[PDB]
Amino acid sequence: MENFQKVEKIGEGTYGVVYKARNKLTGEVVALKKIRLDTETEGVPSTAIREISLLKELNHPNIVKLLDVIHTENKLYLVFEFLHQDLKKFMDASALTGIPLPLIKSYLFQLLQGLAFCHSHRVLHRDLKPQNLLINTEGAIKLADFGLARAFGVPVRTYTHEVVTLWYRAPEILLGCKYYSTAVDIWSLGCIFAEMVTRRALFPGDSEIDQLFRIFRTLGTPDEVVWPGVTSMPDYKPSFPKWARQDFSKVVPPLDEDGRSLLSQMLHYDPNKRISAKAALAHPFFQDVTKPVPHLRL
Numbered sequence: 301m302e303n304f305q306k307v308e309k310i311g312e313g314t315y316g317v318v319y320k321a322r323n324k325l326t327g328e329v330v331a332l333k334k335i336r337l338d339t340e341t342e343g344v345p346s347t348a349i350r351e352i353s354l355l356k357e358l359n360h361p362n363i364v365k366l367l368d369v370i371h372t373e374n375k376l377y378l379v380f381e382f383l384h385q386d387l388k389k390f391m392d393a394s395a396l397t398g399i400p401l402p403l404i405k406s407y408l409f410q411l412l413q414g415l416a417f418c419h420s421h422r423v424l425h426r427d428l429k430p431q432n433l434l435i436n437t438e439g440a441i442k443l444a445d446f447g448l449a450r451a452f453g454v455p456v457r458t459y460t461h462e463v464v465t466l467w468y469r470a471p472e473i474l475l476g477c478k479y480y481s482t483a484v485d486i487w488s489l490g491c492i493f494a495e496m497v498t499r500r501a502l503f504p505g506d507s508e509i510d511q512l513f514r515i516f517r518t519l520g521t522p523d524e525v526v527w528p529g530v531t532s533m534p535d536y537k538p539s540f541p542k543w544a545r546q547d548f549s550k551v552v553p554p555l556d557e558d559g560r561s562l563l564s565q566m567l568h569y570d571p572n573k574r575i576s577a578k579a580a581l582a583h584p585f586f587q588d589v590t591k592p593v594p595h596l597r598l
């Protein structure tokens with residue numbers, strides 16, 4: 301760790317504190333991740349150490365490279381490759397003009413490819429979000445910081461606790477599903493797809509209940525008709541307000557029909573009815589895909 305000179309704070313997260321560092325020996329710039337441990341009342345730090353190393357062999361052009369893991373003391377560090385910008389800073393710097401469709405489509409195609417990859421290895425991300433997506437000058441985009449089945453260590457008290465932004469969280473996770481599948485990542489990606497098009501978060505909930513109701517008000521309240529088993533779910537309540545379903549024309553304009561269709565299959569309430577990453581790659585929406593490069597101010 302002392303073999304890395306910090307440059308600046310590159311990011312955050314519930315899992316740790318991301319920094320832009322330079323290898324004192326190599327010279328190459330990396331993205332070092334500080335993960336503090338709770339030696340007061342620790343739990344399965346060895347069960348995790350193995351789940352982290354399984355990520356080192358997870359190489360794909362659309363997945364940020366985990367270079368190496370260094371466990372020294374009360375801290376655990378993850379050395380990642382560095383890209384020049386996260387999709388949040390880019391979207392914000394594009395709120396005025398809007399990310400061109402060819403670029404939005406290129407991005408979705410790659411994300412779906414990398415997501416399709418890690419999925420075929422029974423690996424999920426669980427916490428997809430624009431700040432976790434890294435882009436470069438050459439027009440590529442990668443998925444970053446794959447969350448574990450159960451995070452660990454010690455939460456941040458300065459950044460303001462553990463649970464913060466739950467805008468792209470799937471309804472099954474909100475309804476209490478403890479054994480969720482690859483579908484949670486697709487929902488999240490579907491929410492990012494929409495935000496990139498409309499230039500406004502699809503479902504910007506403050507809390508869990510608000511997130512869930514924010515989804516209900518737009519896609520209508522789920523029932524046994526559209527989501528078999530929804531009412532038997534751990535956190536469902538018969539007293540849930542019953543809202544009407546809205547047209548995607550009103551939800552994601554001016555996305556063409558090809559886009560609204562694909563996004564509609566990504567935001568299906570029923571996890572088992574939700575479109576798979578590799579299935580979404582064959583969608584007609586990707587008929588005329590290309591890889592244009594972004595305009596970046598670094």
Ligand SMILES: COc1ccc2c(c1)/C(=C/c1cnc[nH]1)C(=O)N2
Binds near residue numbers: 313318380
């Ligand atoms: C959140 O997790 C990660 C992991 C590896 C990373 C970055 C973020 C990351 C973010 C970032 C934001 N501005 C340039 N890079 C980076 O470059 N490499």
